[PDB]
């Protein structure tokens, strides 16, 4: 789920 992007996630 765009692993590389990092940042907030809904999870």
């Amino acid at each position, epitope marked *: *789920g*765009l692993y*590389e*992007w*990092g*940042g*907030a*996630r*809904i*999870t």
Partner: antibody
Framework: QDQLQQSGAELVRPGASVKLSCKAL????????IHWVKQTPVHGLEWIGG????????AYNQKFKGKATLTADKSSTTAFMELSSLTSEDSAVYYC?????WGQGTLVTVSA | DIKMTQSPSSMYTSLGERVTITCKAS??????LTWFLQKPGKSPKTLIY???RLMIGVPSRFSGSGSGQTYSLTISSLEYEDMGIYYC?????????FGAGTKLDLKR
């Protein structure tokens, strides 16, 4: 892996509801968050919220929580966003994004 | 919310020149910054993610930010294709918040 397709322009009356679609293609639907953003001349870019098509989790902005309803349909790999109790301040461009790639936009005009 | 402050608001540049737009976040956004271009009549195009990674496709004239709380997208040499409004976005936390954009126009 590819892209996002938004539904065409909506011309709705005040007091009414609308439902925008964000069909996703070329990747695994239930693995990537879809978020909903709103564009206007006054405020510019605004985030309405997000959905996780796989877990069904949702994150809303406090500005649109009483007016927005995010859903998703795995079978058709479409994100739904429902905007209710339409007011003249809901007239705008609504985008669905997967953060790296974006839909083209859905113009919604509320008018009496 | 994280007030995102993007300056300038607009700018007058010429082909060949070096552009710099800055993004300032009200907190440490842990390099969770994205840069993107709105070409008039079009849906945003992502250019740079997590502060400094160029999206695939993007030309290498485009380059990104810093860390901590102020970030920048530098355009080495300006090309016509690059005219649109630029926008930064933090995704460190919710809600997601955008900077107010920077419009680029050709100068005379």
């Amino acid at each position: 892996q590819d892209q996002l397709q938004q539904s065409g322009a909506e011309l709705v009356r005040p007091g009414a509801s609308v439902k925008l679609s964000c069909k996703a293609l070329g990747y695994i639907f239930t693995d990537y968050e879809i978020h909903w953003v709103k564009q206007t001349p006054v405020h510019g870019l605004e985030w309405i919220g997000g959905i996780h098509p796989g877990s069904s989790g949702t994150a809303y902005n406090q500005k649109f929580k009483g007016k927005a309803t995010l859903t998703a349909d795995k079978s058709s790999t479409t994100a739904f966003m429902e905007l209710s109790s339409l007011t003249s301040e809901d007239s705008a461009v609504y985008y669905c994004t997967r953060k790296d790639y974006w839909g083209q936009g859905t113009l919604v005009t509320v008018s009496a | 919310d994280i007030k995102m402050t993007q300056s300038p608001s607009s700018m007058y540049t010429s082909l060949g020149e070096r552009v710099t737009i800055t993004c300032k976040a009200s907190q440490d956004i842990n390099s969770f910054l994205t840069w993107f271009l709105q070409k008039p009549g079009k849906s945003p195009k992502t250019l740079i993610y997590r502060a400094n990674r160029l999206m695939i496709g993007v030309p290498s004239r485009f380059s990104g930010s810093g860390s901590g709380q102020t970030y920048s997208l530098t355009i080495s040499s300006l090309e016509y294709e690059d005219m649109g409004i630029y926008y930064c976005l933090q995704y460190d936390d919710f809600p997601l918040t955008f900077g107010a954009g920077t419009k680029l126009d050709l100068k005379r």
